[PDB]
Design an enzyme around this catalytic site. Structure first.
Site, short mmCIF file in Angstrom:
data_model
loop_
_atom_site.label_atom_id
_atom_site.label_comp_id
_atom_site.label_asym_id
_atom_site.label_seq_id
_atom_site.Cartn_x
_atom_site.Cartn_y
_atom_site.Cartn_z
N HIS A 97 -22.18 4.66 6.78
CA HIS A 97 -22.93 4.63 8.04
C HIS A 97 -22.49 3.53 9.03
O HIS A 97 -21.66 2.68 8.70
CB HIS A 97 -24.47 4.66 7.84
CG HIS A 97 -25.06 3.40 7.30
ND1 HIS A 97 -26.12 3.40 6.41
CD2 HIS A 97 -24.77 2.10 7.52
CE1 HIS A 97 -26.44 2.16 6.10
NE2 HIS A 97 -25.64 1.35 6.77
N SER A 155 -24.96 8.16 10.23
CA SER A 155 -24.76 8.17 8.78
C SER A 155 -24.05 9.46 8.42
O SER A 155 -24.56 10.55 8.67
CB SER A 155 -26.12 8.08 8.07
OG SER A 155 -25.94 7.93 6.68
N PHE A 198 -26.80 8.85 -5.56
CA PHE A 198 -25.62 8.04 -5.28
C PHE A 198 -25.40 6.97 -6.36
O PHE A 198 -24.31 6.84 -6.90
CB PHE A 198 -25.69 7.40 -3.89
CG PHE A 198 -24.44 6.66 -3.52
CD1 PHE A 198 -24.27 5.33 -3.88
CD2 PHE A 198 -23.43 7.29 -2.81
CE1 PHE A 198 -23.12 4.64 -3.54
CE2 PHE A 198 -22.28 6.61 -2.47
CZ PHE A 198 -22.12 5.29 -2.83
N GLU A 219 -23.72 -3.01 12.37
CA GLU A 219 -23.17 -3.15 11.02
C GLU A 219 -22.61 -1.82 10.55
O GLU A 219 -23.08 -0.76 10.98
CB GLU A 219 -24.23 -3.70 10.03
CG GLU A 219 -25.35 -2.74 9.64
CD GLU A 219 -25.01 -1.83 8.45
OE1 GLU A 219 -23.99 -2.03 7.76
OE2 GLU A 219 -25.80 -0.90 8.17
N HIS A 251 -34.70 10.60 1.29
CA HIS A 251 -33.70 9.54 1.22
C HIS A 251 -33.69 8.84 -0.15
O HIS A 251 -32.62 8.55 -0.69
CB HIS A 251 -33.87 8.52 2.33
CG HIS A 251 -32.75 7.52 2.37
ND1 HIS A 251 -32.87 6.25 1.85
CD2 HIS A 251 -31.48 7.63 2.82
CE1 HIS A 251 -31.72 5.62 2.01
NE2 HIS A 251 -30.86 6.43 2.59
N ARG A 271 -26.62 -7.31 7.23
CA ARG A 271 -25.23 -7.08 7.62
C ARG A 271 -25.06 -7.16 9.14
O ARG A 271 -23.94 -7.21 9.63
CB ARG A 271 -24.71 -5.74 7.06
CG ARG A 271 -24.65 -5.70 5.54
CD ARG A 271 -23.85 -4.54 5.00
NE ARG A 271 -24.51 -3.25 5.20
CZ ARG A 271 -25.46 -2.74 4.41
NH1 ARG A 271 -25.89 -3.40 3.34
NH2 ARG A 271 -25.98 -1.55 4.69
C1 HEM Z 1 -26.65 12.32 1.84
C2 HEM Z 1 -26.15 11.16 2.27
C3 HEM Z 1 -26.80 9.80 1.92
C4 HEM Z 1 -26.75 9.13 0.76
C5 HEM Z 1 -26.06 9.61 -0.55
C6 HEM Z 1 -27.53 7.91 0.92
C7 HEM Z 1 -27.64 6.90 -0.02
C8 HEM Z 1 -27.89 5.59 0.33
C9 HEM Z 1 -27.62 4.41 -0.48
C10 HEM Z 1 -27.10 4.39 -1.94
C11 HEM Z 1 -27.94 3.33 0.24
C12 HEM Z 1 -27.82 1.87 -0.22
C13 HEM Z 1 -26.48 1.43 0.37
C14 HEM Z 1 -26.11 0.08 -0.15
O1 HEM Z 1 -26.62 -0.92 0.41
O2 HEM Z 1 -25.30 0.02 -1.12
C15 HEM Z 1 -28.38 3.76 1.55
C16 HEM Z 1 -28.78 2.95 2.58
C17 HEM Z 1 -29.40 3.34 3.75
N1 HEM Z 1 -29.52 4.65 4.19
FE1 HEM Z 1 -28.79 6.28 3.19
N2 HEM Z 1 -27.92 7.84 2.24
C18 HEM Z 1 -27.54 9.00 2.86
C19 HEM Z 1 -27.80 9.35 4.16
C20 HEM Z 1 -28.60 8.66 5.04
C21 HEM Z 1 -29.06 9.13 6.32
C22 HEM Z 1 -28.71 10.50 6.95
C23 HEM Z 1 -29.81 8.15 6.86
C24 HEM Z 1 -30.50 8.19 8.23
C25 HEM Z 1 -31.83 8.02 8.26
C26 HEM Z 1 -29.87 7.05 5.91
C27 HEM Z 1 -30.49 5.85 6.11
C28 HEM Z 1 -30.25 4.72 5.38
C29 HEM Z 1 -30.58 3.38 5.80
C30 HEM Z 1 -31.36 2.93 7.06
C31 HEM Z 1 -30.03 2.46 4.72
C32 HEM Z 1 -30.17 0.93 4.67
C33 HEM Z 1 -31.18 0.52 3.59
C34 HEM Z 1 -31.22 -0.98 3.55
O3 HEM Z 1 -30.17 -1.57 3.20
O4 HEM Z 1 -32.28 -1.57 3.88
N3 HEM Z 1 -29.09 7.39 4.83
N4 HEM Z 1 -28.31 5.14 1.58
#
Ligand code: HEM
Ligand code: HEM
Lengths: 350, 359
Positions: A320, A219, A306, A143, A299, A178
């Site tokens: 991502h 990501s 965000f 996804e 996170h 997704r």
């Molecule tokens: C600084 C950059 C990042 C921001 C601002 C951030 C913010 C967010 C936001 C707002 C979501 C929800 C997305 C949505 O469904 O609308 C999300 C999802 C997610 N992020 Fe991040 N993220 C960042 C970096 C990362 C990194 C580096 C990882 C790696 C571990 C990560 C792992 C995840 C995962 C696994 C989800 C899926 C959550 C779910 O839908 O169950 N993110 N992130």
């Protein structure tokens, strides 16, 4: 509202979502689209590793040979180059290539210019570490999520185009949903990460076999076009917490299910830093990746930031791609890398 | 099986007699393992529908306290009568209008016994008396009745369950369905087949909030009520500090937000209340009483708001060596017909009065 799952991949669900179909996302997000011609992609991460400053010229040139090899028939449709220093102090240049099918990447790998360069004895006497971490998710096994619509990085680059505003995002559990296969499958992990050739403690050639439903997240963060204020928002406000999170996963992998965490910055052909970065994280299962992202403070803070700042983002580009693979669709080869390199660190020795 | 069951061998949140073939699945595989133990209320098929009766006294002036405390003592004395609640506890809180509220909550094991109580002469004549209109005090009744399939409980302790847990048969072993967003939903037995979707509006069906006097509000389908509690009474100093210095200030902040920004997030009424004894002395126990427009909206707040997320991560970090600090919750949904919200001389911002439509 549009679905994240492409039309041809939609089917009768035996597993349901965690939100009703009336759900409305809090902000717009977009996914990569591709028709049934895109059956299975190949994501090939090709690395050069070195410890000392005087190894850089040889390392950069090796990276340039790899990139030249892409111009050959059956090369990857898209690629990018990154740099990072791991927690053992080793510098790692990684070239990622994306192919649109399995057989093209196989033909490319097995072709004489490429296979000979790789199988060569020089690789054992260059002084450099080489690795290839090549994974092949089917269309239903990955996804993408983009906070933008144009010039898609990563696997989005090898897909047809961009979707409209999608429904399945903005809550924990949305990532799973997704994945097209999540309509029928738990993407449950089984098996162990195991060495099947060589010994990491000895150097030389080592092959690690993956197991079913290992996950891979790329990501990314692209702040290259950002003005002063947005530059500062990401670099001074968001990154410090992201950094902290990346350090945690890098240094506490086993504790949360993370086989390998990398926080890399993009480079040009000459090895100058560009203003894009991303995470390359390998996970023992997708649900462990789910548990970390929804529970770890780092996170959770950037997630919240965000939500607060999304409407005002103009040039900052966040996205991502996440994947799972059958055991047979993974290949991890290491030549003269240190025992903590990627899939070496947690691989059970023969 | 083994001495310590794991994965699909772990106990379920869902009572045995309430389990069925699922049409709606969980968001985790059956091999999922919680990172720390939690427990739930257990009850056999004798428990079909409980009644949670939140009974209130409201005042604003300092000189109304003895009159308010006495009115509370009377409502509590009424619990000594036949068909009284199987459990109760009393609380105090000041709302965002500066009004003081004393709430007594009673829990019943069945619907009909609470009805025999609500209608019995000594209770019914006290409520319907015209003296309530001239006492000067505000009064309210927020009486909700979820079926066994329509509430879930979660306890980070095994003994002396507060709330609706007190009227259940006992405590489960380690349950599987917790430790992730969406597990609350999955602990509702009805979630096996139903989406618990909200429909209809909150409506005044008698009287007018603006005038005062008697106002009757009708609830709609699948309103959600959460009571999320904290008990630090018997805790040693370090866990008392943990709660009061590290948890409470951001918990307070979060409750303030829900109290003052309700409509923006779908929280009809949010109360953050402290337990008291019969004399009105504070005890070291508190809880949230939060009525929501939908279970989804409560889900959205708790998984995204920095206040709840902050304290959630604190718990994850301290869970392993918590010994005496006691945290729990109960969450319910009701059919429109199983809700009653009555208000006598309460200000227009009290409970369901604030967000109801008029005429
Ligand atoms: C600084 C950059 C990042 C921001 C601002 C951030 C913010 C967010 C936001 C707002 C979501 C929800 C997305 C949505 O469904 O609308 C999300 C999802 C997610 N992020 Fe991040 N993220 C960042 C970096 C990362 C990194 C580096 C990882 C790696 C571990 C990560 C792992 C995840 C995962 C696994 C989800 C899926 C959550 C779910 O839908 O169950 N993110 N992130
Ligand atoms: C003492 C302060 C609190 C702490 C430390 C805290 C912590 C947590 C924890 C650890 C969980 C997950 C339990 C599990 O499944 O293992 C949780 C769930 C939840 N909490 Fe709280 N909480 C607190 C107060 C509150 C309050 C006052 C509310 C009222 C809105 C609230 C709403 C929720 C909801 C709706 C869930 C369900 C999450 C889901 O499964 O989707 N919490 N909380």
């Amino acid at each position: 509202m549009e679905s994240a799952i492409g039309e041809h991949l939609q089917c009768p669900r035996t597993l349901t979502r965690r939100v009703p179909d009336t759900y409305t996302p809090p902000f717009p997000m977009w996914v990569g689209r591709a028709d049934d011609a895109l059956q299975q992609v190949v994501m090939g991460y090709l690395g050069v590793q070195f410890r000392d400053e005087d190894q850089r010229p040889a390392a950069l040139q090796a990276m340039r040979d790899i990139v030249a090899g892409f111009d050959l028939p059956d090369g990857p449709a898209h690629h990018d180059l990154t740099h990072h220093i791991d927690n053992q102090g080793y510098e790692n240049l990684i070239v990622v290539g994306y192919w649109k099918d399995v057989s093209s990447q196989h033909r490319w790998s097995t072709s004489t210019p490429i296979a000979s360069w790789w199988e060569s004895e020089d690789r054992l006497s260059d002084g450099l570490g080489f690795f290839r971490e090549i994974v092949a998710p089917r269309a239903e096994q990955f996804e993408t999520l983009y906070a933008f619509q144009e010039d898609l990085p990563g696997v989005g680059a090898v897909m047809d185009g961009i979707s409209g505003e999608i429904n399945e995002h903005g809550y924990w559990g949305s990532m799973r949903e997704r994945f097209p296969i999540s309509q029928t499958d738990w993407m449950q992990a089984s098996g162990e990460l195991r060495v099947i050739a060589g010994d990491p403690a000895v150097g030389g050639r080592v092959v690690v076999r993956g197991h079913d439903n290992i996950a891979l997240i790329r990501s990314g963060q692209d702040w290259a076009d950002a003005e002063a204020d947005e530059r500062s928002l990401y670099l001074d406000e968001i990154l410090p917490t992201l950094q902290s999170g990346m350090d945690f996963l890098r240094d506490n992998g086993p504790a949360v299910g993370c086989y390998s965490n990398r926080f890399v910055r993009n480079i040009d052909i000459d090895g100058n830093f560009l203003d894009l970065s991303y995470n390359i994280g390998h996970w023992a299962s997708l649900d462990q990746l789910e548990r970390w992202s929804e529970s770890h403070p780092t996170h959770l803070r950037i997630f919240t930031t965000f939500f607060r700042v999304a409407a005002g983002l103009s040039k900052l580009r966040l996205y991502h791609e996440v994947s799972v693979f059958d055991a047979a669709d993974q290949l991890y080869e290491y030549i003269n890398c240190h025992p903590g390199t990627g899939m070496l660190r947690d691989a059970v020795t023969i």
